[PDB]
Design a protein around this ligand. Structure first.
Ligand SMILES: CCCCCCCCCCCCCCCC(=O)O
Ligand SMILES: CCCCCCCCCCCCCCCC(=O)O
Lengths: 256, 268, 57, 238, 268, 57, 60, 125, 60, 57, 59
């Protein structure tokens, strides 16, 4: 027979296998697909690197502590320097792609914690100073996680993202993040969360470096807690695979 | 029409409708009848006011400005932005992407301003409103060639009748208007960051066509926006915060909700 | 070319509308479009789940 | 010139009016439409989606993520009350800021059932049984478990599926209940009790947490759309 | 059409049409012909003005209020109640339960108020009326955000033309409006008692959009109610008493009728 | 969709009405509804009574 | 623009007038009707019902 | 698929859901049923309160101690003052009814104990 | 006199408006049309024609 | 003699127009006349030239 | 309606679309596809504001 919990996803030369998982979520019920000729603004033929770009890429893990406000990643920036996919976007003016997200956390039966894995289109963070927009370095972290702060940023006259957890940086209630596609990881019931995203954007193709389409955010509604002598370090790993990636506007490398 | 409940009778079974998993993220969908015995009830209720078009098909005042028949400030200029009024901004923010035709009503009221001059005679004021597309020359003075409007849409209104009304076709370089843009104006990423980057809807100019009397007159023009033929996608949570600027989403941090005395208590 | 449509009335009657402009953006709003489908936002997951079966098995 | 009469109210401005007016630009060519995911046709569909409930909205808890969490612990005697909140979604502090409550603040009348979802967030070893009850209006709020059992209730068991759904039947003399609190229509009282004491093995934590999710059922409906109370501006923003 | 009398001829019979019993409570129904010889008469008379709709399809002024362009009282607020006008109240009271659409006409007249200021110039006043549903924020000052009316129905009127007119759909939580409620607001029965318990129709606010001249101007707004598509049930006797409050039916005690000099006399 | 109806005239002649709104609450009043039935208020009693028979027997 | 003339009495208010005017709220869903006893269609039917007569209306 | 252990019983406005249970026992293989006209001694029509009387009623819990001889309840007395069902019997000279019994105990895997739940007709102490 | 309502914006002047108005002279006989070369129906056709480019637009 | 024509709408709906004057110069402008032919201004030369052949041979 | 580009694939040929003569005065008329590989794109764009009447029909 078969188990609803067991799953196996194979993309390119990378295979992911988890013994226990919550049912996979397609965010709007739409599978990612290549762009239609009827809908295509650009005359020039697009280049499709196929399996090269479309493979799982593993990011740097984070430590779940009993008092971690939250961890958040700008996905386009996350894969901006990783393999051929990082190289293709640097070479090309326009790129449109689907994204596969897989968040894995492992804990003992005795451990208890709940993490919310939500992908949000067009999240705009708001600067702590009202008169100043947020800095790019604060807004996007390349090769490293950016962390939410439990307290609101202190009074300041400098660029700085507003990181308070309840607002989530968008100045909106954390609880209503349900409307955005999401999957809950509960240590007693779930080992890991898989979310599949259709490409989303007003324009059919957009320059990846100037504009970021979706932002993966992880927040613990329930703090991690354990009895003494249990493993005190818990690791959360984010693996992202591009889907149906295509590129246009062959150009000299670099952004300015 | 709203779905109508089905009558149910007691049963003991292996099946478990009430039991479900939050982790999957599939919202549970269970009728009252599965949890308890119910009676067959027909519902004539209609979901006909929750439609996006009905919710957003009402005039609201986006902004108002004042100009003077005499003195230095002859005419008023306003850049055309939805964000400067909180009620219009909050409802538009409910969807990430919106496509919609725009209906515009202008209401102009003139108030006499107290003055030293005497025996004033006032012929009916006529007011001209002129809309300029990006890169059209701006008027520098009230008596400028720009006020001819040969290539520019323009309306002339005589005081004492129905307010002037116009319909606007969906104007965007993009397929849909973007309520939120997570992006920089330039490739480098050093520069202004925000929805203001995609903001190029033009500017609106209002002037007295003629001066009826010597005494100073101040005129207020109020601009009203009504979405039509609305189409929405990618819905967003309620804002939950007071606004601070119309160019950014910067916010003072806000508590989640108003607080009751105790978890048990029923009093707010 | 007059168009005859039903009016908004209670339960438990037609209005004539004629277009006098060709811009097509000068028409009235489509208030009577009562169609809804929660399938996108609710039940997003690929594998379908029955109302009364264990959610995870 | 055909003879014509002028109706009373000629040359008047109504916010909610539907008429035909001449376009500012003749024959504009609009940009072609393209396929976008998550298209929205009705507000109710957004309200059907579950929203986390800040049940513990007291003092410092709203400032932290502790608002959403509901405290539970192993206790010497069975029958203690986990929590109690007002049935109506619109006026009550607990449901006012949620997805469904925010949509309701926009509309004057509300109708139909509410689904409440409860997910245990304790260790695998931890086990327990709780009694979730709804009491019909005109009866003082239940003060003991025996009184609560008289009101319709679902007995929940932890383990196997880790979430439960208590569905509150609509029980109103009126077809529509005001979103604003009304003396005439009282929605009800919702309360939780320990069916049995929570039991844990040595080396497992005695105290766990329970999150609550609130949503509109299929029968739910709204009317008389009105301006929302929460959003206000002292001045136009710049 | 009215029933037409049948001709009759003299007869001696066992049958007794005139004789009847009051105790049964079945009203006696006997034609003139049964009591006396009559002649065949055709009647073209029509019962076409006694219809409930014709009786209640005429505008009446429910209430009027005054607001000032200057001074402390900038705007006027009136809670929407049928009871405050005796003629409207008496006819509505004739049926216990009534269901009906509402037609509203507002007439606004402005009177100049005498003042020390001189050489005043007055631009045409524009008047705004805004209706708020229960729980909508009330305006606290005339320059408030509440006056934007993005979510609230509102009308703008310019002086010197036809009065603004609107049609209202039947608004009730209940299937029918209740002229009389024998009930308490709470289960305990300690509290206000009366129809006021079922009273939640909202509030109406009127303000000067603009001030034409320095001198003080006072404006009176009159509200007119016309029932439409009327449906009635459970008819009630004539009130027979002067009213005292609009929140209760409390009455000073009243003699049954005006008194004649003697039972025999034909003079009132 | 024009509707033709009779006018109110004396005894011992048609008016055209067109609805220009879809709210259905914007229509004119139904003045011509001349139907009456006193059976409820008068002759309320269960057992029917004939015009000329002893009322109680 | 079709040529039109204005009749005398344009922009006047008559208490007993029957005309079509735009609803304050578009597409409102009215509450469903339910059966009520003693429905009334005509005033005359109420007058047919017998009424007690204060024939001795003198003084006290 | 389904689990033999999972169960859900719905009576009136009360629903009982246990993740793990032993197969339900019908004591003599007979479901409770209303009395037959052929078998009915009394001429007068009976009154059936339906869902009011037929709902789950929860009794006061007891503490299981390492040395508890036993706990026992007289069932008719148990529900004698509970809801409409307590009221109907006080009002009426004769009553016949079926009874549903549900005994719930929760313990950690490490705990070990065995309880015997038996319903006995006409027990005379 | 048919009953009529007046829309908001009655008696207003819009530069880009298309309506029917009465001729100053009734029944004028217009001069007959004759064939002219290079007839123009679209602005784009003029833009398709090549134009010399002042690429060296510096100083003198 | 009413005339029914299509309106200006987007891609990826009819307006009635009646003439009330006989001057014919009182009619609306012919905005919808989308016909173009660059053959006059571009490719003026007598002998036709193919897209990919030497221009002079 | 605006003309829609045709998809093209690489080829080596005697024919020379890009090469032309200015002296003839016949404006060159070559699509993007002749100069480079292109993809089939449908255009819904309309030349409906460039008409002489629309350009000159404003007060
Ligand atoms: C002729 C006077 C009126 C001129 C009107 C010019 C067109 C204004 C269009 C504004 C559309 C705003 C759309 C939402 C906000 C945004 O996307 O920028
Ligand atoms: C937009 C301005 C007009 C606002 C009108 C609001 C709706 C008023 C409805 C009043 C109905 C009164 C019915 C009879 C008395 C009662 O039952 O309360």
């Amino acid at each position: 027979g078969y188990s609803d919990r067991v799953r196996s996803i194979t993309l390119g030369n990378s295979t992911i296998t988890t013994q226990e998982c919550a049912n996979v979520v397609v965010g709007y019920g739409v599978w990612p697909d290549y762009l239609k000729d009827n809908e295509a603004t650009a005359e020039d033929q697009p280049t499709q690197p196929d399996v090269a770009t479309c493979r799982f890429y593993t990011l740097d893990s984070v430590q779940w502590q009993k008092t971690s406000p939250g961890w958040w990643w700008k996905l386009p920036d996350a894969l901006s320097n990783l393999g051929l996919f990082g190289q293709n976007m640097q070479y090309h003016y326009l790129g449109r792609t689907g994204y596969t997200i897989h968040v894995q956390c492992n804990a003992s039966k005795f451990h208890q914690g709940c993490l919310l894995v939500v992908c949000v289109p067009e999240a705009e963070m708001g600067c702590a100073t009202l008169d100043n927009t947020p800095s790019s370095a604060e807004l996007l972290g390349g090769d490293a996680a950016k962390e939410f702060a439990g307290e609101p940023i202190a009074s300041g006259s400098n660029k700085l993202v507003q990181r308070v957890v309840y607002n989530a940086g968008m100045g909106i209630g954390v609880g209503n993040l349900t409307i955005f596609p999401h999957q809950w990881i509960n240590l007693r019931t779930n080992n890991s969360a898989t979310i599949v995203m259709p490409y989303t954007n007003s324009v059919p193709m957009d320059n990846m470096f100037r504009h970021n389409n979706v932002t993966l955010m992880v927040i613990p509604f329930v703090p991690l807690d354990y009895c003494p002598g249990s493993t005190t370090y818990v690791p959360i790993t984010v693996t992202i695979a591009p889907m149906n990636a295509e590129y246009n506007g062959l150009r000299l490398a670099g952004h300015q | 029409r709203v779905a109508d409940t089905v009558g149910t009778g007691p049963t003991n079974s292996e099946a478990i409708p009430a039991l479900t998993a939050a982790e999957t993220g599939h919202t549970s969908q269970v009728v009252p009848g599965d949890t308890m015995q119910t009676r067959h009830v027909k519902n004539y209720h209609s979901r006909s006011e929750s439609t996006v078009e009905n919710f957003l098909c009402r005039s609201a005042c986006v902004y108002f400005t004042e100009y003077k028949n005499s003195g230095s400030k002859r005419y008023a200029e306003w850049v055309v932005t939805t964000r400067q009024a909180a009620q219009l901004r909050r409802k538009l923010e409910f969807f990430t992407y919106i496509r919609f035709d725009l209906e515009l009503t202008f209401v102009i009221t003139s108030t006499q301003q107290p003055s030293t001059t005497q025996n004033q005679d006032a012929q009916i004021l006529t007011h001209q409103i002129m809309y300029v597309p990006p890169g059209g020359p701006v008027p520098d003075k009230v008596d400028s060639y720009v006020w001819q409007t040969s290539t520019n849409p323009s309306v002339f209104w005589t005081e004492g009748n129905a307010p002037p009304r116009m319909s606007i076709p969906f104007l965007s370089i993009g397929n849909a208007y973007s309520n939120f843009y997570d992006g920089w104006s330039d490739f480098s990423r050093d520069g202004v960051y925000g929805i203001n980057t995609l903001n190029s809807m033009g500017t609106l100019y209002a002037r007295h066509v003629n001066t009826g009397g010597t005494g100073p007159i101040k005129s207020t023009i109020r601009i009203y926006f009504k979405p039509k033929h609305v189409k929405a996608w990618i819905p967003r949570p309620p804002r939950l915060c007071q606004y601070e600027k119309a160019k950014n989403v910067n916010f003072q941090p806000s508590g989640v909700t108003t607080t009751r005395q105790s978890i048990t208590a029923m009093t707010n | 070319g007059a168009q005859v449509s039903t009016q908004k009335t209670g339960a438990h009657i037609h209005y004539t509308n004629i277009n006098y402009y060709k811009d097509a953006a000068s028409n009235s709003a489509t208030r009577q479009d009562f169609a809804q489908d929660p399938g996108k936002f609710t039940e997003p997951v690929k594998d379908i789940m029955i109302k009364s079966l264990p959610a995870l098995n | 010139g055909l003879p014509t009469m002028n109706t009373p109210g000629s040359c008047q401005f109504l916010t909610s009016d539907d008429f035909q007016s001449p376009s500012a630009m003749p024959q504009y060519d609009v940009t072609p439409e393209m396929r976008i995911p998550g298209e929205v046709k009705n507000l109710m569909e957004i309200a059907e989606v579950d929203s986390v409930v800040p049940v513990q909205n007291v003092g410092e808890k709203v400032n932290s993520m502790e608002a959403y969490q509901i405290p539970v612990r192993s206790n010497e005697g069975s029958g203690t009350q986990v929590f109690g909140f007002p049935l109506q979604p619109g006026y009550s502090s607990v449901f006012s800021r949620t997805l469904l409550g925010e949509i309701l603040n926009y509309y004057t009348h509300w109708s139909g059932s509410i689904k409440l979802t409860f997910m245990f967030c304790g260790s695998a070893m931890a086990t327990g049984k709780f009694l979730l009850a709804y009491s019909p209006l005109g009866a003082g709020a239940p003060t003991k478990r025996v009184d609560a059992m008289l009101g319709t209730h679902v007995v929940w068991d932890v383990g196997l599926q880790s979430s439960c759904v208590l569905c509150i039947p609509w029980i109103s003399q009126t077809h529509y209940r005001y979103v604003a609190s009304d003396e005439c229509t009282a929605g009800g009282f919702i309360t939780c009790w320990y069916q049995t004491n929570i039991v844990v093995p040595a080396d497992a934590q005695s105290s766990c947490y329970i999150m609550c999710f609130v949503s509109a059922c299929n029968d739910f409906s709204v009317r008389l759309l009105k301006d929302t109370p929460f959003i206000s501006q002292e001045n136009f923003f710049q």
